[PDB]
Amino acid sequence: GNDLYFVKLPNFLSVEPRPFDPQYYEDEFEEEGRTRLKLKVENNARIVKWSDGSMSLHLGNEVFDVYKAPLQGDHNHLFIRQGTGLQGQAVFKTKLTFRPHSTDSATHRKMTLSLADRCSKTQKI
Amino acid sequence: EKERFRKAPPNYAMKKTQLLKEKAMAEDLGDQDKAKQIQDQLNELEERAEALDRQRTKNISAISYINQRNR
Amino acid sequence: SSVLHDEFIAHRLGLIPLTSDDIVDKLQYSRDCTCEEFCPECSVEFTLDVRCNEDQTRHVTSRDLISNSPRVIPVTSRQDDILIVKLRKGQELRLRAYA
Amino acid sequence: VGLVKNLALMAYISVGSQPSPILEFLEEWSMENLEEISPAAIADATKIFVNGCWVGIHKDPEQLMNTLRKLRRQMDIIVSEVSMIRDIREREIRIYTDAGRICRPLLIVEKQKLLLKKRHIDQLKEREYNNYSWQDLVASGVVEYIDTLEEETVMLAMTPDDLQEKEVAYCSTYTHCEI
Amino acid sequence: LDSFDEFIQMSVQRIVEDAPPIDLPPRYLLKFEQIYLSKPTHWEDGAPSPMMPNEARLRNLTYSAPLYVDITKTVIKEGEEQLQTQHQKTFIGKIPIMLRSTYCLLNGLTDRDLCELNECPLDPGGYFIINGSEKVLIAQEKMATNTVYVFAKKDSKYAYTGECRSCLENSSRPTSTIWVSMLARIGQRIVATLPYIKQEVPIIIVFRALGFVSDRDILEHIIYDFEDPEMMEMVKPSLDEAFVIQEQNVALNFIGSRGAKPGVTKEKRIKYAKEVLQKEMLPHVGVSDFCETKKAYFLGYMVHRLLLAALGRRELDDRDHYGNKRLDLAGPLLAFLFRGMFKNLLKEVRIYAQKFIDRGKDFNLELAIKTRIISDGLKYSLATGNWGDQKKAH
Amino acid sequence: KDRDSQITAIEKTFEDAQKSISQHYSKPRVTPVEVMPVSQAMIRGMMDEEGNQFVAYFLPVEETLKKRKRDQEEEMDYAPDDVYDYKIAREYNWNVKNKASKGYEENYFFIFREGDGVYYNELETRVRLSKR
Amino acid sequence: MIIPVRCFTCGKIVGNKWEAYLGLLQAEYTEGDALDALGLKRYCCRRMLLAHVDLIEKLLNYAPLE
Ligand SMILES: [Zn+2]
Ligand SMILES: [Zn+2]
């Protein structure tokens, strides 16, 4: 009920802070556009634990592969600060002595146009 | 005409055609062309990878197995 | 059409041992035979014809060396075979050889 | 003879990066900026050197070096290719982010023990079968690229064990180990 | 690969977009901005396709990308008629690609694909194909920029010379090798070899021209501790040796009186000596309108450090020491070129704008853009090995 | 592109991690064992100082000096700057409040085993404690 | 490129033993027992199989056709 459940993810894996709800979700977004749509059709979560002590984070058939590496610059307490009480009622939980090291990736594309043009014009007469 | 009908990928031409397919996908601002390209690309990839594993099915396959277990 | 040279094939063919006991004390040395080319009295003729048609790679072995004499064969009688080349899908090798 | 040379196996040459987040960061410590300084306050204060540029003055150089290295391990504000050199005898901190600096990876030492614990070897032995790699040793702060000009200041061991045992003392202040 | 990648991503751009807008009777603007590079091609008189490195090798071709830029033809005339017509993706030249780089066709590419391209999976990369020749750029070593050194050229009027190869960041201005040195011998005088000045000048006269009228005020920059008379009595000989010049203006006269082109009128001279002390000397510190206060600090640092070496308080610098060296890899080697090659084309478009406005007609940049500057300069230097222009190749 | 594709694939992946797990890219080398399901305000701490706002280096079993954390905002112009401490008497304690260090704050989403439920509790603003 | 037909030193045929040797490394053998099980007594002949690098496997990837 309390354990290491903090999960950093990169920009391209930004999961919604709230459950999926049909009343909260809208169509705004569209190789170029391929990376665009992925932001909300994927990104509720199930961090699967494995016999080697690795973890895999799943938001589909696509996989983020994860290790519970230690942390020393970020020694905070994690807490559910909901606006209710005096000025955000932070409920106590786990301390940030570790955070995920993990792999989530992208790609590029190719192009081609033309070099120079014709020349050697001549006026009448 | 002569580029149209005969089976295109084997042996080397599939690599340049795969690149060309990628370029066709990337040059399109239209999502339909992109997705059609993506589909096409995946299919040719699969076909090609099958063909590669098929050729390597024998006597290449055998050496692959010893190298993975030796390291 | 193999991945090796021309002389690589020929060199490797040279080093394959041939069953000699019954025949070698009968033959003329080549330089001593009256024939204008080669004779069964001064040589044994060999033949390799291999085409990889299938998908898998082809182990060109001493099995492929077909002799005209039944006794002067490569060592196959009674344990794998001397690998000559490996062929891919569409590559081939035709040669005739004399011992 | 001796003019044409060869790289070492693990030599890496700095590809270069802008000194601008460093400038932005160094600003918001207890620095003092060069143009708003009284000429009488340079005597007992260490001189800061970004890419050859004397950009600032600092009254406490033991807080900077410990802070700059922590970032240079944690892969965030200071990129791995940067070298930070502390001159003790003269009150100078020199930082280079520029390109063309030859450097090589070393294991980090703390107390007199390596940061390369058996966890890293276990994750790194199981690479390919999982996504882990050399860059995770960098990002975990286990190994560090050290420039020739920063190698001037390391107290370097040559094997993990043999140099970090307990005898009559050689140094007992090792900072790094050879790979 | 990394060197190259940084050149393609972050030095091709930033050499384009560094150059000044050209003008010329009404006059124009003519500004460059975004740059575009494609995968390599050969038939962009055949049908367009990617060139593969192995075809480039077999046909004695040059493995290169076409290169394009966004140009605004911006112009204004009488009547406040103005326009900013943009030529998106104007061709500039062809740039040779390093094998297995971020912009090669052979990038992130599997063993299966490499074999299908008839190319080696073991091939490291890092070389150019130039007329079907594999070329490598050998990493040329050099003394590190922006870093003060001290040496004893005893074979001269100088007992010690302090040095700085001051440079800004890949600027159209090259490095200025400043020297600040101590004469042998009153005795004990100290001089700046400032750039483009005919001869070296005593360091105190530099700080006077910088704008420091007071004596007290110059030495606070060069001597940090006023409490050790050790360093006080060391600068006296030079401080005595500048008592005739007290204001900024007479000071300027003194440097301006020694430019390569000394101005006939006095104000010409001052206009010179103000310019060299703001753009020429110590660029890395700043080239702005007012940077004297920080140029002052760094020069006092060089004098300070020479005084430290001379007092014997600090050990002389070793020129052989590899920390005092840097390596021109395939990035910086190319950036050095591309600067000059881009300058050449701005000289072309210049004369081409001129020949065309003078007729009172209108001028067209598509014909002005000489493709053969880049495409051939690159291809040339990477071919001969001569790191320069073809006409000054010796 | 289209909305129906998105609602389908999202609500489907709120089930495609809840199926049976038995093969993977890293099979046969490994097989899966078990599952950890998924505003906020985290008071960062300095590793040197070792901050008293939440006692991570000692892990207290009960508050020796308070009933609960009365951690309101440090000012009316300062709602994200919470008091970040476990105090309930008006006593002059030393516990460090959350300062507006946004500069370094950066990103940090938090989640929990909410009874094996689909939710999220991502962090709002990574504020930091100090020796004040 | 491809396993020699004979041990260069002595002249024993090793050309037939390479497939078999890799087959004995599909089994869990040390190379020392693989070499022994094939009957290579001399330290000449034993070098041929230890030291042979099989490059014909890589040259075979460069298809001519299909
Ligand atoms: Zn005969
Ligand atoms: Zn032998």
Question: What is the Cα–Cα distance from D114 to D160, expressed in whole angstroms?
Answer: 7
G2: which chain C residues are within 8 Å (Cβ-Cβ)? 4, 12, 83, 85-86
Question: What is the Cα–Cα distance from B15 to A110, expressed in whole angstroms?
Answer: 14
Q: Dump the DSSP string for F61-80.
A: SS-SS-SS----BSSTT-TT
Q: Cis peptide leading into B11, omega within 30 of 0? A: yes
Question: What is the Cα–Cα distance from G1 to E81, expressed in whole angstroms?
Answer: 75
> DSSP H helical segments within E257-291, as ranges?
266-273
Please state, in angstroms and as integers, the Cα–Cα distance from residue C57 to each residue in C54, C80, F43, G59, following that order.
8, 17, 65, 12
Question: What is the Cα–Cα distance from G58 to G66, expressed in whole angstroms?
Answer: 16
Instruction: Retrieve residue E192's tokens.
Output: 């700046």
C and D touch with 3+ CB pairs <8 Å, answer no
- d(CA B12, nearest CA chain E) in Å: 4
Point out which residues pair with E312 in neighbouring strands: none
Residue pair E299/D34 in contact (Cβ under 8 Å)? The answer is no
Phi-psi region of G45 (alpha: psi -120 to 50; beta: other; left: phi over 0): alpha
Q: Phi and psi at residue E273, in whole multiples of 5°?
A: -60, -15
Q: In 3D, which of D86, D99, D83 has the Cα closest to residue D148?
A: D83
Which residue precedes each gap in chain C (C to N above 2.5 Å)?
78
Q: Phi and psi at residue B53, in whole multiples of 5°?
A: -65, -25
Per DSSP, the three-state class of E157 is: coil
Residue pair E81/E56 in contact (Cβ under 8 Å)? The answer is no
Instruction: Retrieve residue E154's tokens.
Output: 């005893």
Per DSSP, the three-state class of E189 is: coil
- d(CA E117, nearest CA chain B) in Å: 6
Smallest-distance ligand from the CA of G12? 2
Question: What is the Cα–Cα distance from G21 to G23, expressed in whole angstroms?
Answer: 5
B and C touch with 3+ CB pairs <8 Å, answer yes
Place of tokens 């993977």: F24
- d(CA C39, nearest CA chain G) in Å: 28
Residue pair E163/E148 in contact (Cβ under 8 Å)? The answer is yes
Residue type, E196: Y
Q: Which residues of A touch D (CB under 8 A)?
A: 52, 54, 65, 67, 69-70, 73, 101-103
Smallest-distance ligand from the CA of C42? 1
Which residue precedes each gap in chain A (C to N above 2.5 Å)?
30, 43
Please state, in angstroms and as integers, the Cα–Cα distance from residue B33 to each residue in A31, A50, A112, E4, following that order.
10, 40, 18, 33
Residue pair B42/B25 in contact (Cβ under 8 Å)? The answer is no
Contact flag B15-E105 (C-beta cutoff 8 Å): no
Instruction: Retrieve residue B17's tokens.
Output: 């055609």
In Å, how far from its chain's centre is CA E262?
A: 25
Question: What is the Cα–Cα distance from A14 to D97, expressed in whole angstroms?
Answer: 31
- d(CA D52, nearest CA chain E) in Å: 5
Q: Which chain C residue is nearest to residue B59, measuring alpha carbons? A: C57
Q: Which CATH superfamily is domain G1-66 in?
A: Homeodomain-like (1.10.10.60)
Point out which residues pair with D96 in neighbouring strands: D83
Question: What is the Cα–Cα distance from F50 to E9, expressed in whole angstroms?
Answer: 43
Residue pair E75/E69 in contact (Cβ under 8 Å)? The answer is no
**Half-sphere exposure (Cβ direction) of E267: Cα atoms closer than 13 Å:** 0
Return the H-helix or E-strand segment holding F10.
Answer: helix F3-13
Q: Within 10 A of F97 (CB to CB), how many other CB atoms are there?
A: 20
Q: Which chain A residue is nearest to residue D71, measuring alpha carbons? A: A73
E and G touch with 3+ CB pairs <8 Å, answer yes
Which chains border D (3 or more CB–CB pairs < 8 Å)? A, E, F
**Half-sphere exposure (Cβ direction) of E353: Cα atoms closer than 13 Å:** 21
Question: What is the Cα–Cα distance from E215 to G48, expressed in whole angstroms?
Answer: 85
In Å, how far from its chain's centre is CA E193?
A: 20
Point out which residues pair with C3 in neighbouring strands: none
Q: Is E188 exposed, middle or buried (0-12, 13-18, 19+ CB in 10 A)?
A: middle
Q: How was this structure determined?
A: cryo-EM
D147-157 burial, b at 16+ Cβ within 10 Å, e below that, comes to bbbbbebeebb
Q: Dump the DSSP string for E223-243.
A: -S-TT-HHHHHHHHHHHGGGT
Q: Within 10 A of E115 (CB to CB), how many other CB atoms are there?
A: 20
Residue type, D8: A
Q: Which chain A residue is nearest to residue F49, measuring alpha carbons? A: A75
Question: What is the Cα–Cα distance from B45 to B25, expressed in whole angstroms?
Answer: 15
C20-58 burial, b at 16+ Cβ within 10 Å, e below that, comes to eeeeeeebeeeeebeeeeeeeebbbebebebebeeebbb
Give Rg (Cα) of chain D.
18
Strand order in the sheet with D83-87: D57-58, D46-50, D92-96, D83-87
Per DSSP, the three-state class of E219 is: helix
Three-point CA angle C49, C52, C55, nearest 5° = 165
Q: In 3D, which of E313, E326, E324, E309 has the Cα closest to residue E161?
A: E309
Q: Does D36 touch chain E (CB under 8 A)?
A: no
Return the H-helix or E-strand segment holding E252.
Answer: helix E248-256
The topology (CATH level 3) of C1-99 is: RNA Polymerase Alpha Subunit; Chain A, domain 2 (2.170.120)
Question: What is the Cα–Cα distance from E173 to E167, expressed in whole angstroms?
Answer: 8
Q: Which chain G residue is nearest to residue C60, measuring alpha carbons? A: G16
Q: Dump the DSSP string for E304-361.
A: HHHHHHHTTSSPPPPTT-GGGEEEE-TTHHHHHHHHHHHHHHHHHHHHHHHHHHTTTS
F42-52 burial, b at 16+ Cβ within 10 Å, e below that, comes to bbbbeeeeebb
Instruction: Retrieve residue A48's tokens.
Output: 């699967």
Residue type, E134: E
Q: Which residues of B touch E (CB under 8 A)?
A: 11-12, 14-16, 18-20, 23, 48-49, 52
Residue type, D61: P
> DSSP H helical segments within B1-71, as ranges?
13-26, 31-55, 61-70
Q: In 3D, which of E9, G61, E107 has the Cα closest to residue B19?
A: E107
Which chains border A (3 or more CB–CB pairs < 8 Å)? B, D, E, F
Return the H-helix or E-strand segment holding E182.
Answer: strand E176-183
Question: What is the Cα–Cα distance from A52 to A37, expressed in whole angstroms?
Answer: 34
Give the CA diameter of chain E. 81
Domain ranges of chain C: 1-99
Per DSSP, the three-state class of B50 is: helix
Per DSSP, the three-state class of E140 is: strand
SS3 track for chain D: CCCCCCCCCCCEECCCCCCHHHHHHHHCCCCECHHHCCCCCCCCCEEEEECCECCCEECCHHHHHHHHHHHHHCCCCCCCCCEEEEECCCCEEEEECCCCCEEEEEEEEECCEECCCHHHHHHHHCCCCCCCCHHHHHHCCCEEEEEHHHHCCCCEECCCCCCCCCCCCCCCCCCEECC
Residue pair A101/D136 in contact (Cβ under 8 Å)? The answer is yes
The per-type count for chain F, helices as H runs and strands as E runs, is: 2, 3
Please state, in angstroms and as integers, the Cα–Cα distance from residue E285 to each residue in E200, E268, E293, following that order.
21, 26, 10
Name the packing angle between helices F3-13 and A34-41 (round to 10°): 50
Instruction: Retrieve residue B53's tokens.
Output: 């594993």
Question: What is the Cα–Cα distance from F12 to F6, expressed in whole angstroms?
Answer: 10
Q: Fill in the DSSP letter of residue E21.
A: P
Question: What is the Cα–Cα distance from E275 to E197, expressed in whole angstroms?
Answer: 12
Residue pair E223/E244 in contact (Cβ under 8 Å)? The answer is no
In Å, how far from its chain's centre is CA E28?
A: 27
Phi-psi region of E125 (alpha: psi -120 to 50; beta: other; left: phi over 0): left
Residue C41 counted as an annotated binding residue? yes
Residue pair E243/E208 in contact (Cβ under 8 Å)? The answer is no
Instruction: Retrieve residue A12's tokens.
Output: 């391209």
Distance (angstroms) between ligand 1 centre and the Cα of C10 equals 21
Question: What is the Cα–Cα distance from A105 to A64, expressed in whole angstroms?
Answer: 9
- Determine how β-strand F32-37 pairs with β-strand E325-328: unpaired
Q: Does B60 touch chain C (CB under 8 A)?
A: yes
D139: which chain A residues are within 8 Å (Cβ-Cβ)? 101
Contact flag D129-F30 (C-beta cutoff 8 Å): yes
Return the H-helix or E-strand segment holding G46.
Answer: helix G45-51
Contact flag E117-B16 (C-beta cutoff 8 Å): yes
Q: Does D28 touch chain F (CB under 8 A)?
A: yes
Question: What is the Cα–Cα distance from B31 to B28, expressed in whole angstroms?
Answer: 8
CB-defined contacts D:F, below 8 A: 6
Question: What is the Cα–Cα distance from E70 to E142, expressed in whole angstroms?
Answer: 35
- Determine how β-strand D156-157 pairs with β-strand E325-328: unpaired
Kindly give, in sequence order, each residue whose CB lies less than 8 Å from that of residue E167, ignoring residues fewer than 6 positions away.
E145, E146, E174, E175, E176, E283, E284
Which residue precedes each gap in chain E (C to N above 2.5 Å)?
24, 44, 185
B contact test, residue of C58, C88, C89 with most B CBs within 10 A: C89
Three-point CA angle E158, E160, E166, nearest 5° = 105
Contact flag A52-D130 (C-beta cutoff 8 Å): yes
The distance in angstroms from the start CA to the end CA of chain G is 22
Kindly give, in sequence order, each residue whose CB lies less than 8 Å from that of residue E146, ignoring residues fewer than 6 positions away.
D51, D52, D53, D98, E164, E165, E166, E167, E284
Q: Dump the DSSP string for chain C.
A: --SS-SHHHHHHHHHS-B--TTTTTTSPPGGG---SS--TTT--EEEEEEE--SSSPEEEEGGG-EESSSSS-BS-------EEEEE-TT-EEEEEEE-
Q: Which chain B residue is nearest to residue A108, measuring alpha carbons? A: B26
G and A touch with 3+ CB pairs <8 Å, answer no
Q: In 3D, which of A81, A78, A110 has the Cα closest to residue A94?
A: A78
Please state, in angstroms and as integers, the Cα–Cα distance from residue D129 to each residue in F25, F26, F34, F60, following that order.
8, 5, 19, 40
Return the H-helix or E-strand segment holding E2.
Answer: helix E2-7
Residue type, C64: D
Instruction: Retrieve residue D90's tokens.
Output: 């003269």
Give the CA diameter of chain A. 94
The distance in angstroms from the start CA to the end CA of chain F is 53
Residue type, E389: D
Domain ranges of chain G: 1-66
Instruction: Retrieve residue D87's tokens.
Output: 């001159």
Question: What is the Cα–Cα distance from A66 to A48, expressed in whole angstroms?
Answer: 10
Return the H-helix or E-strand segment holding A91.
Answer: strand A91-95
